[PDB]
Design a protein around this ligand. Structure first.
Ligand code: NA
Ligand code: NA
Ligand code: NA
Lengths: 510, 510, 510, 510
């Protein structure tokens, strides 16, 4: 057991993220149930009995039929010992759970004690060094000590004598929120489908908000006499107690939740304020809503917005194009051909310009990603395989995928060669004179367009396309600009030797 | 008929898009009418009779005057055989239509069997290969089999004995939605006016949404006793049955549709909830609305937004300009002149920078588009026509249209020549000394500004404008930077020969 | 008068814009008053008398006290001749005005006949050519003929016998809207304060929209029996006729306008629908509103948004900066100094990067604008004034204004000279050794930093700052990069001669 | 005291900003309390007594129990001398405060007299020059004189005879608003947390707006007979005076504030208009709200939006990345590694590209900022410390921080050297053959990658990495591209001498 005294925690383990998730469950526990325990003291308990009165006029106890359709509100008369004698299982449950959550807080604090802080990229896991880092950071001990007084035990509804119980004291536990943030932040970055999680979270915000606010309605409604006017919960406003509904805990939470729902989303179909104090409230609360919920739902909207912003960008680009063609009265054949290009461009979803990977990432990560992705396709290329050098490691960074429509000339005889293409998919044939030539077909992995780039003129043609290469269907090519090939080629003269060695043999035929 | 056994379907035909459109009509059929058939069982049928009671106190049948202004809700008493004996035409109709839709589903599945998948840009239309692709893709047979059990026939209101009918089983047909998406996606990209279609679609979403939700109101309202409180449809809430209105199917759908309209757009002018279960509902539904419709209508807004975003961008640029001139106290003549420039720039709508075509498209498509568009205008140019080479094919990519105000010097004597202009429209005159010179007028298609770019100095003037060219009205010029002309000119020395051959003859006069 | 037969109109005159503005007033006339004349036939007229009945039970005429607090709606009993005998001034007014508006339409059509269309930048003002252009464009005669049948005269409430009058026929005049657009488009581009006008316009849209819709409420309310239920205007719904209010035209338009206001902005505090037909309406209308007004007010918001987007961009940039400095724990002195830089940068509003003028405008317009603006400041510069060449015309395009904080070294001894500064405002002193040197002060218009750029080394110092120049307050400098000065300097060797001629004389001292 | 006659004020002192803040408090004073004093004349006073009547039917005075549950509104009967005899403390208070605020206005005007205007970057503090600048600017004396007539004293409720008092005259003070703007503008630019202040301000706007509007409701409600219908405040609409609430000033302001809250945020749960005039009002006011508040709350939303737009941008970039990796089916190991890179990138918040500082700021400020920040880190570098020249001053502008994942090769043997790295944090070891070499570890401040950049080949290796450098954890490097190092190195040949002097000694080992 002595090993668990000098034990140090690494912040960067998956297990720890599981733990932070646990702290999170404890947190939500408190901020959901504590306040509600404070307001609806009917919950743990009750700590008193109903004393409803029926003529035929003695005060009686509570009968589930006499808590319906009441003339006046039921007087709350307190027990001799309020509590545990009548209700035992319940209170014991709540103590087990609170005790549990608090255990989570404690264990979390022990881990905070041994948190392997990070000195220059490495995790420092040490005996006295870590604890040193703890107490040198005064904030750790300050907030950390603040939420574990366990003052709630003394504020709980126990004792039986002279104390109602202030469960609201548990609110001090709410100051550990930083841990919870560090959880959610790290959960988005894990989730396969982020915007899913990211929307679920926000729905929870709304529900807790609405919750607390409901509790506020009910508390304020307790503070003012409950059943003394048409705005405070109770028989006086017929909205909450229609005649045939029976009074309960469930009802109160239900109606209060409904009330808060409306006021916070400004439908406002709620019985109107009757005391200056209430106007104070309802206005505060209505304004609070027109700002709070404005922003909130203007974020849910933005979230479901940026979700499929790819598609939005796309339809933008395209509509631009089509507009341009309608106004300038281009042919029908050409316009059709274009829109077919876009269609196939988007039904393959290879349309991703990858400028994401380019810009945001470190250069090295671009190399390994593109490596894996195009790995098999390049694996069947003469040029990259032949050179011992990982020159490929250079060129991968700068290859751009271009899609060509079917039956269309990639190349024409007697044209300037600037690019050199490597086929990712589709098959294309070398032809001259609109057929009857040697239809030579290159499949994926093949290399062409290289004769012009390499400045060799055995037949004296020059930077001219020797043949004209045609596509048979929708073909995707890697495009490597002359400048890049050459700027990279000085570094590896062997590749020069091999590529030129092939080039002499291709120009030999001519 | 054996030819229709080995028949294979091409995904890329116009006819197929017509077909997918048909599948679409079947889909909408189901998701509109199925659920409603489930809820309003009054529709197919009814399967029972009304049994309203009037004193003077025997239970009677239904009279269209006694279904108005009722004291209590009508008891539904079931037929001996519920159904087809009394109503025949109707049920037969619904069976013909369901059977029809199902035929569409079946034919669609046979086409799915023979779907010519695309291997490397070409469509593979083959006997066993295609079917191989079907069953290798386990998802095809999984979802495809799932929606055609035809289980509805066994769940339909038939039999007469012991079965009410669960039309809701037909819901399994809803899982073919992917086909419908592939339709809409392909319809936007076809439509001449996209944003039209794109708005119509969204209006349909809203209506189906509102629809289902209405059905939900009515179902939930059936499940709770119908006419037992002030929130469930029926005589109890005077909103739906005002005294003089008669009860009907039409009414129910109408009121329920209205109700859903309000709750989903949070006007919420609707009789308030009376049972805890209903609060549960209405809150669920209100929140559901404040998110669902928030986003939806925040998209209709965005759609009508980006529609004419051209114009918005424009007014932005301009307001910037005008602001700049007011603050810096520029003259009145100059400011007027500018705003006239913008006016004519926007009344011709040739203001499109075409950077759409530039950026989004493949380079080759830019060439053919601009080819067709400027085709006639360039068709009357000496330089492009004279050279046998399709050098034009190079330059078309890099020509920028510049608009010049009337009476203003394009060129002045003794200035650096950097550009070379080709006139798209307007006419402009060569003049020296503010008139009395040889007013030489070039119309569209003409070429000038070329003497300075070509580094020839027979009179030793240099990269200097020989004359000063003036515009007579609003003239549009093609602008070709020196660097481009030259970088392109090395490739075709013949064009050099001809252009210089003209240049010597123009400088000969001087 | 024969001169007014062959008279041709120029589209590009200020007078014409005044005219289009007039056509606009006629347009608004029609789309505001026509529909209302159609609905509230009380307006022109009435064409009948009230026939209210009071017991003590004969039908009587209308008394302004008996049209209040009514038991039942007043029966409309028609005149023997309905109209002009009782009311004369009014109807004559409406005919004078309609006739007037129609005159505007006619004159507009004669101008359309003679509209000088624009052939290649110049306005073609000709006898038969213009008319040729009219009838060759079939649309001109089609829409143009369509709105002037004058069919209204035959549909007016006259005749006395057998005709009620269909003023709604005048709706055909609404098809000239294109002219009105061409007005507003041209008014924004004129207005000194655009966003003012641009907001006023939109407020008019809202009001006309709300208007028509009100008329719709009232029409539909006429079509259904007026005063037969709690949703149609009239004594039945106590919202419109509270007991003490008297019935009038004014009331109807007022209440209907209010009603439409609510339904179109979904407050919806309006008596609820009572007939299936009405639900049809109100839903149609509510949805119509949640889309129409969503967009509309989401545009008013966007308008008041982009208005002062300068300021928004600014606060963005700055908050970024301050954030950066807080996190990285920079000093206090430095941070203060920065924020003072921004303050003075924004209190002078010379902060405009002018990239508006740069990007959007033609290159020539940038030259003349900047010419005028900096005209006086440059007018007092040795270098620009001395050279006969308008070389300035080159450099003006590429000068960037840089603001420097007070007391801070623009230059330090022994540093690389890359830029050359010209002072726009402030005064700065040449000093060495933190004072006690020759404090030489350059005011605006002065030129310095030029010794290093010009590659002259008589003392062999090189591209080194000879002295160190210090600012006394907030000084604004023109900045001209070495590359620009030089690239421009090859073109004018005289400027070289003069600048170097000064340079030898400044380096002479050393 | 004569020194305070020729005393001139500097606009650019902290004290002055304190003063403007004071003027601000006076301003808010007026625009909050003046209008309310005008409307609720109950406030200062009252100037009359209540005269409520109770049968058992003589008119009596006011009793706080008889101002509850009234049958009819209380008649206001005026005093013989209305005012100061009965209420003294109050009125004296208001006069002291108004007089105070006015003193602020006066002192502000004296400061305006002596405002040191800024001529060419320097503050001109002079005797007659400043006053000259005052009166030459006619606007100063125009608006400045306009708000200090002190006309309020003559409009105050005094005199006792024949005057009710028009406090509203004080409105003329509202025209000094420019000063207040110049305060707020300068407060944002000071505040550490801007968006805090920026939101608080907007909440004040809303409250003042709502305020005035409330006053408007109440004024209009006074103008119409108060307690004559169900829309004007008073016993007639049971919303404001429910039976048990007593009538007061407090109530009026409360209810009116509530009313305005609803109408301006279109909840609109308010008793409906009863006179044509009121419809006029409420519609005006409702429309006014649907525009005013639309924009306002669409700004609070935008404010809380751009607040943490860093984080939004980040999640955008990342989600892009993860999407890309899911679709293209990259490995699990690589994907994990990436997301860990992002995690550590964002948990250090050193992720700021600093392009803010780059773009927005002057070049010199970038130098000093980065100087301070990286000061200690660079303070321990051989290269920068050794060279006497402040060459560092050059390179600081162009160093980019790159983060590398742990255990990953920064360098590999036999690769092109393009960059040269300086370690900001982390430690990394030089190793060959996957261990067993000389593990040489560089800590922060160290310099490497320099051998390849400097074109020296004593062993003939060339621009090749001699060793392969590996990281042990998450290491941050300064990256200096070859082009930059060299372009900067020509300027200081000494640095060349030293760096090469080290290079020979490192290549000596090999
Ligand atoms: Na509402
Ligand atoms: Na409402
Ligand atoms: Na609302």
């Amino acid at each position: 057991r002595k090993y668990l005294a000098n034990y140090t925690q690494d912040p960067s383990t998956d297990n720890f993220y599981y733990w932070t998730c646990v702290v999170t469950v404890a947190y939500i526990y408190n901020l959901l149930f504590v306040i509600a325990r404070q307001v609806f003291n009917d919950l743990i308990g009750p700590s008193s009995q109903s004393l409803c009165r029926f003529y035929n006029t003695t005060q009686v106890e509570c009968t589930y039929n006499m808590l319906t359709n009441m003339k006046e509100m039921p007087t709350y008369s307190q027990y001799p010992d309020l509590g545990w004698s009548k209700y035992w299982h319940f209170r014991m449950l709540w103590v087990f759970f609170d005790l549990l959550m608090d255990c989570v807080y404690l264990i979390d604090t022990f881990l905070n004690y041994r948190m392997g802080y990070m000195d220059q990229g490495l995790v420092v896991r040490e005996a006295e060094k870590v604890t040193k880092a703890y107490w040198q950071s005064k904030q750790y001990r300050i907030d950390g000590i603040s939420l574990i007084p366990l003052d709630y035990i003394l504020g709980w509804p126990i004792p039986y004598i002279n104390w109602r119980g202030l469960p609201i004291l548990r609110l001090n536990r709410l100051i550990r929120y930083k841990r919870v943030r560090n959880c959610l932040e790290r959960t988005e970055t894990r989730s396969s489908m982020p915007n899913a999680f990211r929307v679920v979270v926000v729905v929870w915000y709304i529900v807790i908000i609405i919750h607390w606010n409901a509790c506020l309605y009910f508390w304020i409604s307790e503070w003012i006499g409950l059943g003394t006017d048409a705005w405070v919960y109770g028989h006086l406003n017929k909205q909450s107690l229609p005649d045939d509904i029976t009074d309960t805990l469930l009802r109160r939470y239900v109606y209060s939740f409904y009330w808060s729902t409306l006021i916070l989303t400004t439908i406002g179909e709620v019985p109107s304020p009757v005391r200056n104090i209430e106007y104070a409230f309802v206005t505060l609360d209505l304004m609070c809503g027109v700002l709070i919920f404005a922003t909130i739902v203007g974020n849910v909207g933005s979230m479901i917005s940026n979700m499929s912003a790819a598609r939005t960008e796309f339809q933008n680009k395209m509509d631009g194009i089509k507009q341009y063609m309608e106004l300038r009265k281009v042919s029908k054949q050409l316009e059709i051909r274009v829109i077919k290009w876009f269609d196939y461009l988007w039904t393959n979803k290879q349309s991703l310009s990858d400028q994401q990977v380019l810009k945001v990432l470190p250069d090295k990560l671009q190399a390994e990603i593109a490596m894996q992705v195009h790995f098999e396709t390049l694996r069947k290329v003469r040029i990259f395989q032949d050179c011992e050098a990982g020159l490929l490691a250079e060129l991968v960074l700068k290859l751009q995928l271009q899609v060509f429509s079917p039956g269309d000339f990639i190349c024409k005889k007697g044209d300037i060669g600037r690019e050199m293409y490597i086929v990712k998919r589709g098959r294309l044939q070398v032809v001259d004179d609109d057929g009857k030539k040697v239809f030579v077909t290159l499949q994926e992995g093949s290399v062409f367009g290289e004769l012009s780039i390499l400045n060799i003129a055995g037949s004296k043609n020059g930077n001219r396309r020797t043949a004209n290469v045609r596509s048979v269907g929708y073909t995707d090519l890697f495009v490597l600009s002359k400048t890049d090939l050459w700027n990279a080629l000085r570094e590896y003269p062997d590749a020069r030797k091999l590529l030129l060695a092939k080039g002499r043999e291709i120009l030999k035929k001519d």
